Design a protein around this motif. Structure first.
Motif, mmCIF file in Angstrom:
data_model
loop_
_atom_site.group_PDB
_atom_site.id
_atom_site.type_symbol
_atom_site.label_atom_id
_atom_site.label_comp_id
_atom_site.label_asym_id
_atom_site.label_seq_id
_atom_site.Cartn_x
_atom_site.Cartn_y
_atom_site.Cartn_z
ATOM 1 N N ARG A 1 52.251 40.502 44.046
ATOM 2 C CA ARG A 1 50.834 40.756 44.213
ATOM 3 C C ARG A 1 50.258 41.369 42.932
ATOM 4 N NH1 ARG A 1 46.783 41.857 49.008
ATOM 5 N NH2 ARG A 1 47.940 39.969 49.529
ATOM 6 N N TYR B 1 47.727 43.347 40.840
ATOM 7 C CA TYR B 1 46.753 44.365 41.163
ATOM 8 C C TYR B 1 46.044 44.652 39.848
ATOM 9 C CZ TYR B 1 50.457 47.243 39.201
ATOM 10 O OH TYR B 1 51.407 47.751 38.357
ATOM 11 N N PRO B 2 44.862 45.277 39.902
ATOM 12 C CA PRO B 2 44.102 45.468 38.674
ATOM 13 C C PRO B 2 44.857 46.292 37.670
ATOM 14 C CG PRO B 2 42.692 45.768 40.546
ATOM 15 C CD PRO B 2 44.079 45.653 41.091
ATOM 16 N N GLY B 3 44.887 45.819 36.430
ATOM 17 C CA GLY B 3 45.611 46.518 35.360
ATOM 18 C C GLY B 3 47.125 46.380 35.383
ATOM 19 N N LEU C 1 55.754 44.988 33.330
ATOM 20 C CA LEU C 1 56.186 44.977 34.726
ATOM 21 C C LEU C 1 56.282 43.564 35.239
ATOM 22 C CD1 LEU C 1 56.897 46.903 36.893
ATOM 23 C CD2 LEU C 1 54.468 47.035 37.476
ATOM 24 N N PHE D 1 43.314 37.314 42.741
ATOM 25 C CA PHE D 1 42.057 37.783 43.332
ATOM 26 C C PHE D 1 41.150 36.620 43.686
ATOM 27 C CE2 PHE D 1 43.001 40.861 39.774
ATOM 28 C CZ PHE D 1 43.664 41.784 40.568
ATOM 29 N N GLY D 2 40.372 36.787 44.739
ATOM 30 C CA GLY D 2 39.352 35.815 45.142
ATOM 31 C C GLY D 2 39.814 34.361 45.139
ATOM 32 N N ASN E 1 41.966 34.128 40.659
ATOM 33 C CA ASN E 1 41.835 34.691 39.332
ATOM 34 C C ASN E 1 42.756 35.874 39.213
ATOM 35 O OD1 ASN E 1 39.534 32.900 38.865
ATOM 36 N ND2 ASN E 1 38.393 34.285 40.212
ATOM 37 N N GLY E 2 43.621 35.846 38.218
ATOM 38 C CA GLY E 2 44.385 37.008 37.826
ATOM 39 C C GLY E 2 43.776 37.603 36.579
ATOM 40 N N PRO E 3 44.342 38.715 36.092
ATOM 41 C CA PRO E 3 43.850 39.243 34.834
ATOM 42 C C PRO E 3 44.130 38.283 33.692
ATOM 43 C CG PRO E 3 45.184 40.870 35.982
ATOM 44 C CD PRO E 3 45.410 39.552 36.672
ATOM 45 N N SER E 4 43.221 38.213 32.732
ATOM 46 C CA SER E 4 43.360 37.273 31.643
ATOM 47 C C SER E 4 43.838 37.952 30.361
ATOM 48 C CB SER E 4 42.015 36.593 31.373
ATOM 49 O OG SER E 4 41.114 37.527 30.781
ATOM 50 N N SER F 1 45.642 33.123 47.050
ATOM 51 C CA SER F 1 44.655 34.189 47.087
ATOM 52 C C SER F 1 45.123 35.376 47.944
ATOM 53 C CB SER F 1 43.353 33.659 47.651
ATOM 54 O OG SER F 1 42.394 34.686 47.746
ATOM 55 N N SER G 1 38.332 40.568 37.523
ATOM 56 C CA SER G 1 39.777 40.493 37.465
ATOM 57 C C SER G 1 40.357 41.122 36.214
ATOM 58 C CB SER G 1 40.231 39.055 37.523
ATOM 59 O OG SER G 1 39.755 38.394 36.383
ATOM 60 N N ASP G 2 39.535 41.361 35.196
ATOM 61 C CA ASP G 2 39.977 41.999 33.958
ATOM 62 C C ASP G 2 39.664 43.479 33.913
ATOM 63 O OD1 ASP G 2 40.805 39.480 33.104
ATOM 64 O OD2 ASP G 2 38.933 39.082 32.062
ATOM 65 N N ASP H 1 35.856 39.995 42.956
ATOM 66 C CA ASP H 1 37.331 39.946 42.962
ATOM 67 C C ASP H 1 37.985 41.313 43.062
ATOM 68 O OD1 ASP H 1 37.187 37.126 42.804
ATOM 69 O OD2 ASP H 1 37.965 37.017 40.741
#
Lengths: 355, 355, 347, 355
Positions: free
Chosen positions: B235, B237-239, B244, B261-262, B265-268, B290, D80-81, D111
């Motif tokens: 999963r 999670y933000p940041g 990790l 997310f949504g 979208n993951g972090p880019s 999602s 997401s960022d 998100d």
């Protein structure tokens, strides 16, 4: 140890299937004795209980629950029930009031909301739970909702001091005068559209004690057999003619619940309004309820013609409104003005006053 | 006459309460024999049935339902179940496939969605109902959901030809690979967020035959014991730091379901994307699901770095996604491109392809 | 390239505090001034800004006079609306009708029947709060109805509210205060609006391009609705069913059960003998009438309404009774059919 | 008479532009809003000679007039960022302008909006003024959108009511920020507050749950916690998750973790996994147990016999709230471990319901 009277009036719950058609099913007690969830044989013999008295197995907490089955005759489809049948039920509860700690009433679903609403008014100063219940499928059919509905009602009435006429179905306890039947097929047959359930049953039992009414121990039970019979319900539909409304409101009608559109709007054509004025002049009292399942009547419709003889039903169900009107019109020796004041009060938890 | 095998693997349903705490509860068959709703003694003696075989009372319609109880040892909390336990269950069904017309599997609720999803993939060309069920409260506690869940699963498997791994709870039959657990306390514990129930039980039994998959009578059952074990769920999670993620995706991991997310979208941040690229280069396959209960992943996240090694999970539950990935990775002698193609197909009714 | 709609404004809260068109012209979401001047459009015609996909949507506002509270509407008002649509049928690709919420379900149901072989969307909409009040539901309801009618070929009378498109003859008003005012209890919405527009094409009815629109101005006016309540006296039912009534929707309990007291059943028998047709609908919001109540006395003159709303039932009965030169048995057959998607036959 | 808001625009779909069926950044929100009568009353602006960075909502039904200033962050972010640092920056913007405005609205991508709202909830200790987050599934520049009404509603709520909490406004509902989670990736009803009612609902009337809304402590000043521990993570346990993977996930420098477990708070009980939790607890890692289920609560007990008081029940908290609270508590200076555990077990911002 807590003792309940189980009153069986009729309905699908107790019926038998015979060639894909339901017929009456007497001797409920003979079936319940053979079901371990409803009757603990071992505890019965070990306490030498009389064999009209059933004993539920021990629950998680609480005291032991015993109950006696009283079967009415003849058993009724709930569509055939009237104010007189509900009065009879109230008189049964009255007669046995001191001998039992609670009551469960098996009743057909079709008019259960009307029954619960009526009993709510009839049983003034009620100190003990009166829990109505029923089922979409008979308890004698293998796959049914009746077992759990009946057991739940008994457990609730047996274990909690909720001094109200309630309806228990599908793991939910509703205030009786707040429910209406919304689904003719699903096990979730009822809804309390403008009030939370009084209780919910899951792994735990959650009770809305903030809503549950307060036991007034000092005041005795007063049972109102004096319910006005000449009250009706009238659903206004678009273009409903004045002549039909005139006919509907003719003597000897004393009260009517008008079901109007949205926030309480009926048609404003002059000939219809005139018929409402005329009925108010004859002394007829009118209560305005919304056709909508959810929400409330805002005051104003027809007040310039019918004056104080037309009263807003706010967020009441039509079942509650009809019961309250029957109750209030049945009270002896009141002025019209006093009746109108009573209709505008929350007498049994059936109506939310604006805050 | 229709015969079922009832496989009891563990879970709250079969447990005992002892000082407000649940402990294991063996000998399910010895309890069921004493409950009329689960065992018709009279019909058993009148047919001299062996006493490992129970017989449901007659239902409204349909044929008579008999069942045998197979109790696994040891019994498991569902949180302790793994791919191997589910393979064992699939092998039990395989071994007894020709002797029974359907199967019911009592299982803990905590990982029931994962179990159902796994079995769904393991039992290729399934022709017969495999209905998982369980309860929030043990059947030995008086007030419970277990009696009606267990009876309903038996009646559904006994009376209808629904050739799918399903979940029956609270009067609803769900497609197994479409469910997820949404409530840890209520009797309505599960939801099928992106598909209707296959069936609903009320006064009538309603079945969505339009959705139910088609029995392919010609093809034999094929049970997949080769399910890749080195698959994981992650999963985002933000940041979440790249280091990790790097650690999590190390060998010997072969597949991962990324929960983003949504709409997918993951972090880019470049360092994180680089770790996904590097894992794809090691041959790791990634499926993007999602975190939202409801809705679907739109293609595109990380595709410019991980290429075809990152696959959209569309509207799949994470349970279905992890099962499918284990299944696809366990298939013998396929190219990587073929595995990617298979992940993008609706193999068991778990995934809705866009118009 | 370009699709034109007629927006018919009949009354209701949406437009309250005339001249809807003058307000809409000043709202960029409703009127693209720049495109209007750049195409020299006449100034009775509004143009929606470009949407994501689809063609450009233009619309003309027709304001009825007088404007009505929906509680005052009758079969005649709905006939008038149907005739407005008929008259302008070839000139527009779709229609939106602003209507008060109180009887919107009845209006939609009536129009559904009146507009036989409809090939184009007719979308009713309205609001709990007027578009002129800042915080309202009207802007999005109106825009959504225009966009749906402008961009999709759904050949049905529909209701659009709170991001949902319902089949008109399936809806009923369930909340007098919330923005989610309507429910389609026995049918999914035809469409839902979110990030995407999702349409239940499996439910949407089929355009019969060969057959022309037929507008039924011949709707029987002498039809009524009667809600049976516990203990309702036979004498009141007798009075209610007197001539000149031709049809009645009886609202009965649960699965279709009314009281079985002989004097009441006798009144139903007597009305059936006078030629009155009765349709049995459930008082319950959800579910269906099982056949059987009073059939041993009223015979085939009492028909099961199955899962119909009472609004649909009353409309269908008015429609069927208005058809010329049919036997009683034929009328009974037609009431038992799903004529407009209003009724689910058992399977 | 007059109330002034700061509208902080951080990014998200709301402010974006469509370009070839793909969304790109959309600066100059203020230039668009000025042209929309629902967002800007030109006539009142000229008639009061307001500076042209300040917008004025048209007059509402009741209440005072609402003016607002648009602060556009640069660069604009996909949600997401976003990280703890971005949310700190937002908190510092609110701090810097606290005395000049009566409320705040923050446009944010959906998100991670629940994580943002939860973080700000903790960061803004003793908040006296509404901070309302909002966003949209569809950009305000696309004709058919949810953004117009979401943004307007947030402004009106912040402008007209003294709700001293970080909230989320979407689809006519005001939720407590630290109680929400995103449940649908496509519908306009994107968010749910599964274990708490909305703080407010908007319809014909505005209904506010004043019984839930927290109390303004006028005496105490705003304290903004920039000191939020960054080394906190979320870990979703899935069936069969290996101990070695959990070991890797919990390595230094991690200081806290939210474990997402099954149902009522049960993870796998295999000894090697439990040992890794024990070992992490010995290194001083603090663990909070939250349920994977959308609704309901963790019952205490899992792994407590090994991790002792280093594993804390998250009760009914969302995982977003749990992660925020953990970051907040671990960031507090000079506290014993036992104190940190006590704080985690308290309801600090309305995020957790105690039994």
């Amino acid at each position: 140890e807590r003792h309940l009277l189980l009153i069986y009036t009729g309905g699908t719950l107790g019926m038998q299937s015979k060639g894909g058609v339901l017929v009456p099913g007497p001797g409920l007690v003979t079936l319940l004795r053979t079901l371990p969830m409803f009757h603990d044989k071992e505890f019965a013999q070990a306490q030498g209980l009389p064999d009209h008295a059933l004993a539920l197995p021990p629950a998680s907490h609480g005291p032991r629950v015993l109950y006696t089955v009283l079967e009415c005759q003849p058993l009724l489809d709930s569509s055939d029930m009237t104010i007189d049948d509900w009065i009879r039920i109230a008189k049964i509860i009255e007669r046995h009031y001191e001998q039992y700690q609670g009551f469960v009433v098996i009743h057909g679903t079709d008019t259960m909301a009307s029954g619960a609403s009526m009993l709510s008014f009839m049983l003034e100063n009620l100190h003990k739970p009166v829990i109505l219940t029923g089922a979409q499928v008979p308890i004698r059919v293998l796959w049914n909702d009746a077992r759990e509905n009946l057991l739940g009602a008994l457990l609730v009435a047996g274990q909690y001091i909720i001094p109200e006429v309630c309806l228990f179905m599908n793991s939910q306890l509703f205030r009786g005068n707040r429910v209406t039947k919304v689904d003719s097929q699903k096990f979730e047959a009822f809804c309390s559209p403008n009030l939370s359930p009084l209780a919910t049953v899951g792994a735990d039992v959650t009770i809305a004690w903030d809503l549950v009414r307060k036991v007034k121990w000092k005041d005795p039970l007063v049972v109102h057999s004096n319910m006005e019979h000449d009250v009706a319900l009238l659903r206004l539909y678009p273009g409903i003619p004045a002549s039909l409304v005139r006919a509907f409101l003719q003597p000897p009608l004393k009260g009517v619940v008008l079901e109007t559109f949205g926030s309480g709007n009926g048609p404003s054509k002059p000939d219809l309004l005139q018929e409402l004025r005329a009925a108010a002049q004859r002394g007829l009292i009118m209560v305005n309820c919304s056709q909508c399942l959810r929400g409330s009547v805002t005051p104003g419709y027809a007040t310039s013609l019918a004056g104080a003889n037309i009263v807003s039903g706010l967020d009441m169900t039509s079942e509650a409104a009809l019961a309250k009107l029957s109750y209030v019109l049945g009270l002896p020796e009141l002025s019209l003005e006093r009746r109108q004041e009573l209709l505008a009060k929350d007498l049994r938890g059936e109506m939310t006053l604006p805050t």
